[PDB]
Amino acid sequence: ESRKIMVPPHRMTPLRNSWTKIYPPLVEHLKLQVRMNLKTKSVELRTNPKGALQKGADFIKAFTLGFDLDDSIALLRLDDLYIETFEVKDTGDHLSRAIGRIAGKDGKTKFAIENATRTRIVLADSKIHILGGFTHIRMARESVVSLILGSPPGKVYGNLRTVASRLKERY
RNA sequence: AGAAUUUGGACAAACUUGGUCAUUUAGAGGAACUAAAAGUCGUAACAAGGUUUCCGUAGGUGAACCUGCGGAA
Known about the structure:
ribosome, cryo-EM, 90S pre-ribosome, globular, 1 chains, ribosome assembly, RNA-binding
């Protein structure tokens, strides 16, 4: 059995130069066989006769979604990780500054969200993808949604500090 | 038309010299009203929110990358 994964037209040459660090966890660690079909701009992962294919396809889907090699390998190992994709969907007002409210000046609001709840967020123009543990993704998603739907930055920053502490706390 | 004699002089600034209004009294009294500050340490309070990944153009160019503008997820 096999899986196909497309490669978008912005993550093809980074995939190409870092392909030599992608395939050995598909080949000797997980025991699949792979080929990157340049024709349909995809990758075919097949099994050999000597359930790994879903985890390998999720590692490749992380790389095509735009997480780097190391975060894709962090999803590859560490079975308590997930990755949530959502567009904004919730143009001058509602879109041209909502993603600037997410990212902030020099990416520091997205970075503060990332470090506070221990997730990695890749931000497209309007497509947000969050890599991390379950409750981590939950609090990151609530923060992102709170400041696309309009909250004080002081409010969402205080909530990020509180969320960092209570996510690390026992009892 | 000039000079002095003027022929007869209406006029005349300034200088003495009393009643009028405005101000300075050098000053000095009188007898009214109002007014009158005695409180360590106070802050930096202060203002919006385009990141990542490729693509093209233009320049600075180890044609590597960056920057500016225009695109894609």
